[PDB]
């Protein structure tokens, strides 16, 4: 379920969220009874958007950006509070990123990618590009996405995930293949087969850009490629970005 009428959440989207909780949680109705209209709920602090001294190295800034993203918390409610239309102009998506920082609600992988671009537009020596995954577990397909980053010729990632090892990577990987193979290993450890990796182009640092994000500049079928060709195609995508 996706909130499609912005904030505050309209009456219909709100009931739907609480209907969904009623079916998913064993005590679903008791959860709604305890929370809905409760006058003794914790006040959640609005997390502070991190701002950076020009003396702070980019890797340290990325740590603060990831901490901010984590502080919003992974959205387990079953209702996404922000609609992300992936084909929208960057300027529209960065308007959404700003509203995410002002309203400060839980988020999932795609929202974290938009936030990551927004909070690193101040870092022109950092290149940002989305990396999407399609995985298989127990007869079902799963989709995930992170923000690949490149600083000083080394690859890292920002993002939001259920699992610690499927989001943040410090920019220490010497090649793009070493970064993506670390994700593939993490998936292998939680018994997922990696089927496809989709790699985007460098995103503009201009938050008023009318350009779209290119999400699928490279689509790599891991199984059809095999080990060697998969590394070659990842390295080819790394060169394409460095030269453009």
């Amino acid at each position: 379920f996706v909130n499609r009428g912005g904030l505050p959440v309209d009456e219909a989207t709100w009931e739907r969220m609480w209907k969904h909780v009623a079916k998913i949680h064993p005590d679903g109705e008791k959860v709604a009874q305890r929370i809905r209209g409760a006058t003794d709920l914790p006040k959640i602090p609005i997390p502070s958007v991190p701002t950076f001294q020009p003396s702070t190295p980019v890797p340290e800034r990325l740590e603060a950006v990831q901490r901010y993203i984590r502080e919003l918390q992974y959205n387990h409610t079953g209702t996404q509070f922000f609609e992300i239309k992936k084909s929208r102009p960057l300027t529209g998506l960065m308007d959404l990123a700003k509203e995410m920082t002002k309203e400060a609600l839980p988020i999932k992988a795609l929202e974290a990618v938009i936030l990551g671009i927004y909070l690193t537009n101040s870092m022109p020596t950092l290149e940002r590009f989305p990396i999407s995954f399609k995985t298989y577990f127990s007869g079902n397909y799963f989709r995930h996405i992170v923000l690949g980053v490149n600083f000083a010729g080394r690859y890292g990632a920002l993002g939001m995930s259920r699992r610690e090892d499927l989001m943040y990577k410090p920019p220490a990987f010497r090649t793009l293949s070493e970064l993506v193979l670390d994700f593939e290993a993490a998936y292998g450890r939680c018994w997922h087969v990696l089927k496809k990796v989709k790699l985007g182009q460098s995103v503009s640092h201009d938050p008023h850009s009318v350009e779209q994000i290119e999400w699928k500049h490279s689509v790599l079928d891991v199984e059809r490629l095999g080990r060697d060709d998969f590394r070659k195609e990842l390295e080819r995508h790394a060169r394409d970005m460095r030269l453009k």
């Binding site: 998913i24 929370i35 918390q73 409610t77 309203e103």
Partner: peptide
């Protein structure tokens, strides 16, 4: 503001809910 009070009330219920559902998903 009525709209602000509404977002504050909703935000507090969203995080109380998110804690409960995080604890649920934590015990698959």
């Amino acid at each position: 503001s009525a709209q602000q009070e509404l977002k504050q009330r909703q935000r507090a219920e969203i995080y109380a809910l998110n804690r409960v559902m995080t604890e649920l998903e934590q015990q698959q």
